[PDB]
Enzyme design. Structure first.
Site, PDB file in Angstrom:
ATOM      1  N   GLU A  92       0.829  -1.207   0.000  1.00 26.34           N
ATOM      2  CA  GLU A  92       0.000   0.000   0.000  1.00 26.34           C
ATOM      3  C   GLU A  92       0.865   1.260   0.000  1.00 26.34           C
ATOM      4  OE1 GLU A  92      -1.187  -2.766   1.362  1.00 26.34           O
ATOM      5  OE2 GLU A  92      -2.951  -2.842   0.058  1.00 26.34           O
ATOM      6  N   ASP A  93       1.877   1.263  -0.870  1.00 29.21           N
ATOM      7  CA  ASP A  93       2.767   2.411  -1.060  1.00 29.21           C
ATOM      8  C   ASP A  93       3.447   2.820   0.245  1.00 29.21           C
ATOM      9  OD1 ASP A  93       1.560   2.105  -3.476  1.00 29.21           O
ATOM     10  OD2 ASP A  93       0.727   4.132  -3.603  1.00 29.21           O
ATOM     11  N   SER A  94       3.879   1.833   1.022  1.00 29.04           N
ATOM     12  CA  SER A  94       4.604   2.096   2.254  1.00 29.04           C
ATOM     13  C   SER A  94       6.105   2.180   1.981  1.00 29.04           C
ATOM     14  CB  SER A  94       4.306   1.016   3.294  1.00 29.04           C
ATOM     15  OG  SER A  94       4.986   1.279   4.509  1.00 29.04           O
TER      16      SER A  94
END
Ligand SMILES: [Mg+2]
Ligand SMILES: [Zn+2]
Ligand SMILES: [Zn+2]
Ligand SMILES: [Zn+2]
Lengths: 41, 283, 97, 62, 42, 94, 62, 38, 398, 61, 424
Positions: free
Chosen positions: I165-167
């Site tokens: 999740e785009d971490s």
RNA sequence: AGGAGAGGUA
């Protein structure tokens, strides 16, 4: 001549002209000019 | 179903640089040794500071942080005990086994800027003196006046936490690949194709022999496992021209120290710590 | 069709203009595309069916998948008093009245 | 802002190489040659010594 | 003990009405840091 | 107890070893040493929770040696190999 | 640019060819004032009133 | 602003309750699906 | 014929080819150029009549048809947008975000004279660093304050699913050495026309705490005799105390508290191309996929963000930075400029990276740090320039 | 501040701002350019069709 | 009478705004050493419709015992396994597990040895299948395991799954066949997760968790990265030049198709009839008028964009021909985890069609070059003078791509097109 | 302590 100046010379001249413009007017000059004109006239 | 028989050959050895080859071992042993020597070898570094006068342009925490990163000689790191395990004293100032007190005092009375390096850092114990390389590690810069006086102590710590007790620096190992050339498909290639294949390698791993007009293998340890020559050979139309595979039982170590301990001493301490950990894990 | 004058229904005028071509046009399936006045022409059930079809088309265009029972319940709830009331306060007040 | 010590990436002592780097730049040396003369084979140390800006001078002056 | 601004002089004034620097004209004062030991964790 | 022993009821000659305050540097070498033994059938380690510093090792052996015996033999062999490597390094450095 | 209502403005929220070299058409705040606030370009100057009289010089040109 | 329908929304429709916490959420594949890290 | 001489008009300088040859006659001030006619100011209405060339190279191809010329195409963008490398290589939304929000929320140079300013929420980075790439606008401005942040080694790879999740997954060792560490200074102001006093622990006789006192929750920061106490989420160390008064006689007291904001798990970091994410997990240095030369990646990002956000050029920026940083086994004639409308070609970047001794595609073979085995697929690595936003974890805790 | 000497520049401003703001009550205030219609050009609108002449100083539209 | 929060307690988590009833999920409290942050499984982001980019979750701690009892009996995660909107499964594999499973089941050429298979068997709850590969070479010992058997340890022995579309057959808990499509892995009418839920519905969560862990470990062993080779989408320079020429010719053909489709109006009924017309060359030589006519009408613009999409699907189809099987973008597009084919086309080959939603006062010059911007008669310069127009429908085609570099006029066109969704 | 106005997050 038209092409006697060269390509790199024109690029260097563009960079120098941009530097001179940023040195003379600066990032903000419109507000200073507007305020100075309001005081004087 | 028994132990292995490692073989060690040393190519270059210096005070802070060591490059030796490990053979007849699995990659797991090399990886574990690297991890132990990069994160488990203890050294001595400043962790607690106490300043009295600080009128510089920098904050106290900034000076403390850059003081805690200064490398120190750690010849006694193995013999010294941890602060938490020391029941003789709670920890205050100079200690017999754990804490080494450091005193610093700088006062500028001249017009020129005074540079506070790491050379003017005195300690009671002569064996925990900071490592000198040069002008030393600059701490702060002082104008006219602006006195700086502080008291700091150093404790034994593991490199796992705070990443300032780790003496290792870029410990690497490769599989020592072996280059295999069929030597029959090269004859079909033209003169220009050989030069193109040679220039396709990012590093100088293949060489050209003018007297034989064929490619040769020079310095095979600098291949870096970049699949560029193989891709070029596939593009030219030769699938089985050059075959390169890593060697599982051969390794080349490259250990660089930060000056706290010698590279050979670092390897010996890592081996001793790994043996101690295995003994502790033993049921 | 133009809606300049609301005195006469558009469907009523359309029926009169198609007298010479009554046979050509299949009146068994022809129906206005509107929902509000379709109940006054073909009954509440026809308007409910057209509303269900339009809701299914809108759901399909939205790209999501919705079960049939939810749409049927919405249609039955919005036409419980015999007319399709609006979602504003006036419609709910009229439905309660 | 003085030169960041210990070179966070790969942990290399570069705290005493800023003066030498400035001295090399004062002569007819390019950035690459100056960094190579300091015995830096990894690009992390070169990035650390090339991207640093000297800010403490303005702090002392102002 | 308080330090003035552009002028260098120790104020050392604790009165409520004393806000102006003595032998000066500016009313800007900076609190001076005394010799106290402070511990920091590196 | 740093090391815990828990036998597996479903599979005979199976056990699970839980080691506290351990990392991959020990589990990997233990697993690799276990594979050298011919009597060991299943040998592996896992780290389920990075926050919880624990290592779980599962050992399956044939009907010739207990999993604890194989674990002890692997530890002894690894210690002997480390001692031999230290001796070789000491000889080479001089 | 002042707008009577924030919900609807018109075509002012979209870039215009008159923005070439005067204001930045690629950067603008996102939200209620999307496109109303325009950042001036680097080579942007605002003209001021000229005290000199141009009418006299125009007749000389023809 | 607190008048009319907004008054109703802020008084009777929307209410604030105790024993509530609000924090930023990050990812953790090690945790189970039905478990929340506190 | 329409002539305007009023104020409020917008104009830009443009090179004129008619007087361009006069320049060469065997540092020039802008006033001299304006007087000699080499440059002139063209209004918006006047620009529509003249024919303007975009680049110098295009001007020399077909002369006698372009009346005017542009000094640089990158000057059309704003100050916060022209400095972004490969601006035209990114999506419009991401460029808009970077030039509007992330630039303002970046943490960099605060001020060189912090004693004269008592502004609230002043943040300064310990070791600000200028980007490896050069921009023509930045070079002409000659100011290093345009870029706020630090550059770290970034590898595009999955790390146990902790960056989904785009971490963002960062290196614990790199942060502990001083990377992305910033200080926060908060000021408290009180006005008195009652007087300052203690009136009966850390307060002095004058009613203010001494410099160096560790203030916590429930402690009086300003004593009036009322007193002002710190709130639940207020903490810091006293830096300076400023006392001042106006002409009316009203006394003002300002107390500043400073604290160190180490990168926490909930902190949010942003890139120079619109990439936004929060810290996912802090991994030890020994567990990272080290390369052949042992350079572990400082920051690891999920590859799934690139196809969705559609942000090309960040990989180009990483490749250019790697080529510049890596040594050559003649450093002159090296491509460093990253002008948005004068970006170098992909072939040039690949050749530059190949001459440095690395793969031309920017990906290098790496080995797993947990088992030691060599990964089957090469991992792209490059020192991109990242920024730290002002949004923290403890600031959102409620 | 304008046309100050070298010594005066060392003590005072931090040389990071060009000074485009105002000091009202200790808080910096900055004007924002307001886009206004040109008053020296003939303006033609639709619905209804009309042409208007703007006023410079006095209301003589 | 109050005690601190501990393990085993249940809290009600919600992400504002609550767009669906599935936002409220009851989860058991787990204590972690981390501070000032809450940790959530990445799979559970789909019910919350959120991502880890600054999103904040505010929870509710029930105090009454009855509230806690009813919380985990109706609002618990296991009670909400069936989606109430479409009847399908609520929880999917995710953006990473889907790609990992696609890579495992597609390659079919990478064999895992005994050590790696045993290491990966720890996360899987079921036992180890037979190797099925005894000798892959005359001088290769240590028999290996195929990739598809690794994924076969995620199903119960009694679970049977058949997916005719992808030729997926699962018998006795073993995956037998698989060709392509990756449709059974993704959420759908006949996904394997839905069948597993309808089979037992008692251990589906544990199976999903173990599958996610195993796939993450396998992908860490393999490694996934995006480099410049993926964006280049060519083997060498000659392939890149051929692709560029093919893209240019395809765009020209699409423009010609749009121009031909623009003639389907009542004004050209005489020309479209089968007769003798001498104005054939007039309709072809008038190339600059077609764009101006398109930008003025709405129906013509709709027909043109429909024709352009129809003719540009073939252009987009060239990525599979010019893309290698190892391309990360192609893998992620085929797996469906993130992105689509059009995004890759815009990344590498060309952006394609760029049209705005609302009408504007200017029109694109259809060329997007330096000479076009300086043309006085160009539609961008107010009007083309062909009566004077007042409104236009922008319509432009960008031949360049992001990798090559956007022209300033092309960048302006892209900004105008993407100005939408900026205002909320 | 309650309000008014701006810049902002998901
Ligand atoms: Mg979000
Ligand atoms: Zn002691
Ligand atoms: Zn380094
Ligand atoms: Zn004074």
């Amino acid at each position: 001549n038209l092409s006697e100046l060269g390509e790199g010379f024109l690029q260097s001249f563009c960079k120098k002209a941009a530097t001179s413009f940023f040195d003379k007017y600066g990032l903000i000059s419109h507000q200073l000019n507007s305020y100075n004109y309001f005081i004087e006239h | 179903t028994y132990q292995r028989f490692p073989k060690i050959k040393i190519r270059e050895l210096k005070d802070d640089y060591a490059k030796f080859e490990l053979r007849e071992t699995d990659v797991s042993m090399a990886n574990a040794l690297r991890r132990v020597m990069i994160s488990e070898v203890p050294t001595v570094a400043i962790d607690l500071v106490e300043i009295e006068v600080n009128s510089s342009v920098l904050n106290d925490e900034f000076i403390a942080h850059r003081l805690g990163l200064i490398p120190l000689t750690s010849e006694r790191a193995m013999s010294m005990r941890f602060s938490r395990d020391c029941d003789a004293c709670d920890g205050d100032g100079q200690c017999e086994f754990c804490s080494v007190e450091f005193r610093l005092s700088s006062k500028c009375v001249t017009d020129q800027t005074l540079d506070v390096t790491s050379r003017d850092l005195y300690s009671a114990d002569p064996t925990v003196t900071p490592v000198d390389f040069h002008k030393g590690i600059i701490i702060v810069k002082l104008r006219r006046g602006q006195e700086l006086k502080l008291r700091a102590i150093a404790r034994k710590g593991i490199g796992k936490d705070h990443a300032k007790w780790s003496p290792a620096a870029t410990v690497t190992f490769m599989y020592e690949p072996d280059i295999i050339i069929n030597e029959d498909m090269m004859d079909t290639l033209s003169d220009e194709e050989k030069i193109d294949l040679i220039e396709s390698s990012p590093t100088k791993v293949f060489g050209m022999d003018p007297v034989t007009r064929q490619v040769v293998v020079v310095d095979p340890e600098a291949y870096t496992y970049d699949e560029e020559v193989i891709k070029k050979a596939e593009a030219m139309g030769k699938p089985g021209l050059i075959e390169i595979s890593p060697k599982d039982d051969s390794f080349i170590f490259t250990v660089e120290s930060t000056g706290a301990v010698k590279a050979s001493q670092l390897v010996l301490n890592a081996i001793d710590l790994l043996k101690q950990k295995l003994d502790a894990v033993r049921l | 069709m133009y809606g300049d004058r609301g005195k006469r229904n558009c469907w009523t005028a359309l029926l009169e203009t198609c007298l010479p071509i009554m046979d050509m046009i299949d009146w068994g399936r022809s129906h206005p595309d509107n929902i509000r006045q379709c109940c006054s022409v073909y009954g509440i059930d026809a308007g409910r069916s057209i509303f269900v079809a339009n809701l299914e088309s809108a759901v399909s265009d939205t790209g999501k998948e919705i079960l049939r029972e939810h749409l049927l319940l919405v249609a039955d709830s919005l036409s419980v008093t015999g007319e399709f009331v609006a979602l504003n306060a006036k419609g709910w007040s009229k439905q309660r009245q | 802002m003085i030169i960041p010590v210990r070179c966070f990436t790969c942990g290399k002592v570069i705290g005493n190489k800023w003066d030498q780097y400035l001295d090399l730049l004062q002569l007819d040396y390019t950035e690459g040659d100056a960094l190579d003369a300091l015995q830096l084979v990894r690009y992390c140390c070169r990035r650390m010594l090339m991207t640093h800006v000297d800010l403490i001078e303005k702090l002392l002056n102002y | 003990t308080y330090v003035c601004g552009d002028c260098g002089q120790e104020n050392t004034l604790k009165s409520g009405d004393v806000i102006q620097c003595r032998e000066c004209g500016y009313r800007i004062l900076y609190k001076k840091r005394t010799r106290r030991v402070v511990q920091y964790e590196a | 107890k740093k090391v815990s022993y828990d036998r597996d009821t479903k599979i005979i000659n199976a056990a699970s070893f839980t080691v506290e305050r351990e990392d991959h540097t020990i589990g990997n070498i233990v697993r690799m040493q276990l594979h050298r033994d011919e009597n060991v059938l299943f040998a592996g380690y896992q780290l389920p929770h990075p926050l919880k510093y624990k290592i779980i090792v599962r050992i399956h052996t044939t009907s010739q040696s207990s999993p604890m015996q194989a674990y002890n033999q692997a530890i002894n062999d690894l210690d002997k190999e480390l001692d031999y490597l230290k001796n070789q390094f000491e000889a080479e450095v001089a | 640019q002042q707008v009577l209502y924030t919900g609807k403005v018109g075509d002012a929220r979209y870039p215009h060819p008159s923005h070439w070299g005067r204001v930045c058409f690629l950067s603008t705040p996102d939200g209620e004032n999307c496109g109303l606030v325009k950042n001036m370009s680097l080579l942007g100057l605002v003209s001021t009133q000229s005290l000199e009289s141009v009418v006299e010089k125009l007749f000389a040109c023809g | 602003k607190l008048c009319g329908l907004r008054f109703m929304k802020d008084v009777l429709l929307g209410k604030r309750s105790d024993h509530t916490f609000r924090t930023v959420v990050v990812g953790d594949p090690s945790l189970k699906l039905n478990e929340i890290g506190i | 014929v329409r002539i305007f001489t009023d104020a409020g008009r917008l104009l830009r300088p443009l090179l004129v080819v008619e007087n361009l040859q006069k320049l060469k006659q065997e540092q020039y001030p802008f006033d001299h150029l304006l007087d000699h006619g080499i440059l002139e100011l063209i209004g918006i209405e006047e620009e529509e009549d003249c024919n303007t060339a975009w680049g110098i190279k295009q001007l020399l191809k077909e002369p006698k048809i372009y009346t005017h010329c542009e000094l640089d195409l990158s000057f059309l963008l704003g100050v916060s947008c022209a400095v972004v490398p490969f601006a035209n290589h990114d999506h419009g939304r991401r460029v808009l975000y970077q030039s509007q929000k992330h630039c303002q929320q970046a943490i960099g140079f605060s001020s060189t004279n912090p004693n004269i300013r008592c502004d609230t929420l002043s943040q300064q980075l310990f070791y600000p660093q200028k980007p490896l790439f050069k921009t023509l606008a930045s070079e002409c401005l000659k100011k290093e304050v345009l870029f706020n942040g630090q550059n770290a080694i970034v590898a595009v790879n999955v790390h146990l699913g902790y960056n989904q999740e785009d971490s963002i997954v960062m290196n614990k060792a790199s942060l502990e050495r001083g990377m992305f560490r910033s200080e926060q200074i908060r000021s408290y102001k009180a006005e008195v026309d009652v007087q300052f006093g203690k009136t009966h622990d850390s307060l002095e006789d004058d009613g203010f705490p001494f410099i160096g006192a560790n203030m916590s929750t429930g402690d009086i920061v300003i004593g009036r005799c009322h007193s002002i106490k710190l709130k639940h989420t207020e903490r810091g160390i006293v830096q300076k105390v400023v006392l001042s008064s106006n002409d009316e006689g009203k006394n003002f007291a300002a107390v500043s508290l400073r604290q160190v904001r180490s990168p926490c798990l909930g902190d949010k970091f942003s890139s120079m191309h619109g990439q936004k994410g929060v810290l996912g997990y802090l991994e030890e240095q020994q567990n990272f996929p080290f390369t052949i030369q042992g350079i572990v990646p400082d920051i690891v990002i999920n590859p799934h963000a690139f196809p969705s956000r559609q942000t090309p050029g960040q990989l180009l920026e990483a490749a250019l930075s790697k080529g510049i940083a890596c040594p050559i086994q003649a450093y002159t004639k090296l491509t460093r400029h990253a002008t948005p409308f004068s970006t170098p070609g992909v072939t040039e970047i690949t050749e530059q990276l190949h001459r440095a001794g690395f793969s031309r595609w920017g990906n290098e073979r790496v080995y797993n740090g947990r088992s030691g085995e060599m990964m089957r697929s090469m991992i792209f690595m490059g020192p991109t320039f990242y920024q730290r936003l002002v949004h923290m974890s403890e600031d959102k805790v409620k | 501040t304008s046309e100050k000497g070298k010594e005066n520049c060392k003590k005072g401003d931090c040389a990071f701002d060009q000074g485009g703001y105002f000091v009202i009550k200790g808080a910096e205030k900055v004007f924002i350019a307001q886009e206004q219609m040109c008053t020296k050009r003939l303006w033609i609108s639709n619905s209804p069709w009309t042409v208007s002449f703007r006023s410079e100083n006095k209301r003589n539209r | 009478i109050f005690r601190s929060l501990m393990d085993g307690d249940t809290v009600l988590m919600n992400r504002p705004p609550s767009i669906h009833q599935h936002s409220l999920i009851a989860m058991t409290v787990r204590i972690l050493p981390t501070t000032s942050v809450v940790s959530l499984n990445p799979i559970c982001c789909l019910p919350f419709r959120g991502d880890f980019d600054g999103d904040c979750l505010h929870g509710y701690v029930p105090q009454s015992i009855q509230a806690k009892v009813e919380l985990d009996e109706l609002v618990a995660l296991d009670k909400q396994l069936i989606n109430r909107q479409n009847g399908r499964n609520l929880l999917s594999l995710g953006q990473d597990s889907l790609t990992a499973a696609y890579l495992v089941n597609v390659e079919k050429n990478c064999y895992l040895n005994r050590a790696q298979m045993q290491q990966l068997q720890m996360y899987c709850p079921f036992q180890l299948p037979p190797p099925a590969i005894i000798k892959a070479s005359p001088s290769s010992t240590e028999p290996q395991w195929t990739g598809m058997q690794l994924f076969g340890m995620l199903f119960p022995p009694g679970f049977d799954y058949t997916y005719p579309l992808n030729n997926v057959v699962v018998s006795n808990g073993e995956l037998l066949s698989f060709s392509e499509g990756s449709a059974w892995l993704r959420d759908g009418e006949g996904n394997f997760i839905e069948r597993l839920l309808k089979h037992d519905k008692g251990k589906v969560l544990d199976i999903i968790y173990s599958a996610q862990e195993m796939l993450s470990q396998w992908l860490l062993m393999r490694g996934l990265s995006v480099s410049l080779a993926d964006l280049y989408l060519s083997s060498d320079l000659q392939s890149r030049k051929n692709l560029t020429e093919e893209i240019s010719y395809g765009l020209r053909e699409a423009e010609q198709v749009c121009n031909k489709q623009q003639l389907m109006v009542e004004s050209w009924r005489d020309f479209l009839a089968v007769n003798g017309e001498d104005k054939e060359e007039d309709s072809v030589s008038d190339l600059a008028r077609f764009c101006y006519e398109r930008q003025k009408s709405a129906t013509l613009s709709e027909l043109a964009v429909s024709a352009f999409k129809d003719a540009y699907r073939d252009v987009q189809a060239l990525a599979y021909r010019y893309g290698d099987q190892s391309n990360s973008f192609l893998i992620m597009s085929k797996a469906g985890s993130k992105g689509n084919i059009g995004k890759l086309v815009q990344h590498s080959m060309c952006i394609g069609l760029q049209n705005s939603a609302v009408s504007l006062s200017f029109g694109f010059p259809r060329e997007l070059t330096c000479a076009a911007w300086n043309d006085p008669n160009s539609p961008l310069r107010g009007a083309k003078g062909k009566t004077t127009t007042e409104s236009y429908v922008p319509y432009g085609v960008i031949e360049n791509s992001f990798l090559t570099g956007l022209n300033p006029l092309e960048s302006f066109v892209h900004s105008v097109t993407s100005r939408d969704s900026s205002f909320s």
